[PDB]
């Protein structure tokens, strides 16, 4: 119950997706 109390905006879900995207982009040019 407590997790839903503060984890509701879910900004760190789309932000985590953006972080995966940036890691993939950095790998691309680096390789």
């Amino acid at each position: 119950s407590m997790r839903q109390k503060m984890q509701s905006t879910d900004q760190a879900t789309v932000e985590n997706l953006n972080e995966l995207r940036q890691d993939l982009s950095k790998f691309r040019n680096e390789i």
Partner: protein, 661 residues
């Protein structure tokens, strides 16, 4: 102290380690690998307890969920979790430690979430919600459930009532959403008193229902739609139903108030445009001619003058003028010019009393008609009506006692020789009390003014706490009165032994103040206003201990009464007024609407001296309701949807088109 990990979680196996990791990532090649692993063998759960299906639902990958269903994993409560997550696609796909209580159904959860699209989807399948029993139901099942498990019973009832009060569900499934909102709000308000444990939840639900009804009314775009809504009968029937259910915000809507104003001010176009001096002159000249208008209506009810008094504002002015004339005639009775002699035991009525008699009969007949027509229950709600009943009863008692005194006594006698319980004295006292009660009724006319109305309402709402304070003060007063009377009752002295034959504290030399309980209560009452002298605690026998104890008790009573309680009351009244001031406008408008509607009817046209002498309308209503609901749904969607939609379209569009390129 080092302590230990008393509570832990079962470790994940190698297969469990491999699984839910690709599921969190969601790569479809890893999904093919998971399918291959399943063929090699899926139901493993994360430490949160969510299986593969639930976390796949969270990932919002419909293909993954479809593949999981093909593998025939345990569905469990996946539908409820999808409804809670409020994702339409997963709910549609599913249609094609337990988190929730066992009584929860998908439709109840959807109504709890108040999602219009999901509720529309589920209600297409024709789901049902169990109906609740009465608030005071005493049957076999209710008693068995309450005795076996009361907490679960209360929780189930609260869940059902919370599901039934969803604005989206009411809009979709109710034939008359406004009436349903009214009835549900009233019923939920009544349930809060019986179920004291869940008072806040029921109050919140009732407030939500009221707000939904008001916001549904707020979407009218023409006067024709407003008339159709307000005049619907299952004459302003809907307005009367709203008044009956205490829908203050619904009544105080500006458009409804404008319609009521144009109904009330009939015959006076552009009344607001006129300067206030012109308004005052018009009111005075209209109220001056009340007898002529009353007679004209009595003779020719359908002529111009006859129709003049049928308008609500003119009728109100005439009634006010008649009451003011009655009060002015009451003021002339106390003038000594009326009373020729004061030594007649049984006197005949004077001229002023003869003039006052028709008004008294008129008021009694009006109150009888009001009570009989409205019924006993409606009559007591006013509170003001109680005053009317008391005044009329006192007037009747005065008349009866006057007749008895006239019949019985037939001779002149000095007034100082009359006994204590002479009928004339009782009649005079009752008449004076009746005059006091009659003069205080003019406060009820303050609600018609925009300046003195809200103040009168606010002062009315502040009289509830003063009584609660007075109860505690009464306890304190009784305690101290008992103590003082117990101390001082031995030294009671007779009236002969005192100067001028006084006993009590209504004399220049106060005496015997604490000799009886009644006199002690009166003496302690008058000390609040400082009208009791300090020498009343003295004893003729001059005993020092008794006088010291009495003075100490009197001082303690004075300190407690005047230093603590009065300041506490001042602070409490300060706090209460600030909260009341916020909602003064709505309450005043509700009160003025109640006052106005009493003059719309044709029953009480004449003032007190002179009184004693279906399918087509339903089709139109359903058309208007259809338009209002459609506008309301779009407006509430706007606040919820635009920001979320824009944000989702940005990143999602960015992360797939680039991959395709």
């Amino acid at each position: 102290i080092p302590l230990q990990i008393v509570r832990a979680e079962t470790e994940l196996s190698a297969e469990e380690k491999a699984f839910l990791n690709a599921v969190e990532k969601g790569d479809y090649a890893t999904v093919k690998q998971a399918l291959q692993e399943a063929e090699i063998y899926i139901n493993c759960m994360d430490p949160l307890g969510r299986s593969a299906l639930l976390i796949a639902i969270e990932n919002e990958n419909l293909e993954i969920m479809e593949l999981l269903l093909n593998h025939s994993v345990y569905v469990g409560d996946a539908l409820l979790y999808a409804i809670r997550k409020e994702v339409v696609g997963a709910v549609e796909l599913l249609l094609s430690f337990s988190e929730f209580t066992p009584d929860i159904t998908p439709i109840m959860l959807a109504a709890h979430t108040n999602n219009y699209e999901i509720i529309k989807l589920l209600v297409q399948k024709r789901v049902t919600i169990p109906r609740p029993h009465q608030i005071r139901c005493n049957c076999v099942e209710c008693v068995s459930s309450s005795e076996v498990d009361s907490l679960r019973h209360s929780r189930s009832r609260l869940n059902i009532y919370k599901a039934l009060a969803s604005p989206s569900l009411i809009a979709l499934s109710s034939e008359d959403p406004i009436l349903t909102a009214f009835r549900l709000g009233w019923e939920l308000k009544e349930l809060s008193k019986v179920e004291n444990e869940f008072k806040a939840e029921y109050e919140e639900l009732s407030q939500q229902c009221k707000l939904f009804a008001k916001d549904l009314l707020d979407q009218a775009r023409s006067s024709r739609e407003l008339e159709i809504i307000l005049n619907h009968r299952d004459d302003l029937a809907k307005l009367k139903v709203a008044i009956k259910y205490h829908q203050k915000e619904f009544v105080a809507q500006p458009n409804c108030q404008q319609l009521l104003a144009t109904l009330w001010y009939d015959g006076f176009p552009g009344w607001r445009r006129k300067h206030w001096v012109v308004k005052l002159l018009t009111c005075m000249t209209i109220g001056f001619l009340f007898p002529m208008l009353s007679i004209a209506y009595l003779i020719s009810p359908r002529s111009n003058l006859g129709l003049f008094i049928k308008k609500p504002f003119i009728k109100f002015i005439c009634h006010t003028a008649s009451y003011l004339t009655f009060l002015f005639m009451l003021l002339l009775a106390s003038q000594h010019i009326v009373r020729t002699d004061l030594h007649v035991q049984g006197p005949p009525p004077t001229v002023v009393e003869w003039m006052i008699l028709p008004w008294v009969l008129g008021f009694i007949w009006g109150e009888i008609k009001e009570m009989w027509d409205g019924g006993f229950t409606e009559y007591i709600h006013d509170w003001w009506n109680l005053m009317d009943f008391a005044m009329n009863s006192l007037y009747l008692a005065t008349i009866s006692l006057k007749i008895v005194a006239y019949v019985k006594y037939n001779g002149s006698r000095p007034r100082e020789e009359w006994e204590m319980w002479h009928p004339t004295l009782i009649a005079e006292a009752l008449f004076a009390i009746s005059n006091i009660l009659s003069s205080l009724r003019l406060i009820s006319l303050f609600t018609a003014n925009s300046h003195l109305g809200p103040l009168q309402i606010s002062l009315g709402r502040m009289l509830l706490d003063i009584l609660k304070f007075l109860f505690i003060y009464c306890l304190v007063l009784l305690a101290f009165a008992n103590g003082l009377n117990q101390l001082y009752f031995y030294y009671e002295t007779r009236a002969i032994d005192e100067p001028n034959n006084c006993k009590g504290i209504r004399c220049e030399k106060q005496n015997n103040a604490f000799s009886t309980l009644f006199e002690t209560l009166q003496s302690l009452f008058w000390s609040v206003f400082g009208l009791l002298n300090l020498y009343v605690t003295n004893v003729k026998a001059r005993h020092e201990f008794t006088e010291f104890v009495g003075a100490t008790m009197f001082g303690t009573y004075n300190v407690i009464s005047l230093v603590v309680l009065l300041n506490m009351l001042i602070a409490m009244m300060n706090n209460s007024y600030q909260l009341i001031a916020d909602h003064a406008d709505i309450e005043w408008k509700f009160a003025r609407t109640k006052l106005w509607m009493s003059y719309f009817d044709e029953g009480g046209t004449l003032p007190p001296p002179f009184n004693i002498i279906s399918l087509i309308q339903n089709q139109h209503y359903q058309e208007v309701i259809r338009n209002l609901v459609k506008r309301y749904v779009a407006a509430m969607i706007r606040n919820s949807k635009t920001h979320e939609g824009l944000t989702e379209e940005n990143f999602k569009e960015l992360k797939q088109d680039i991959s395709s390129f």
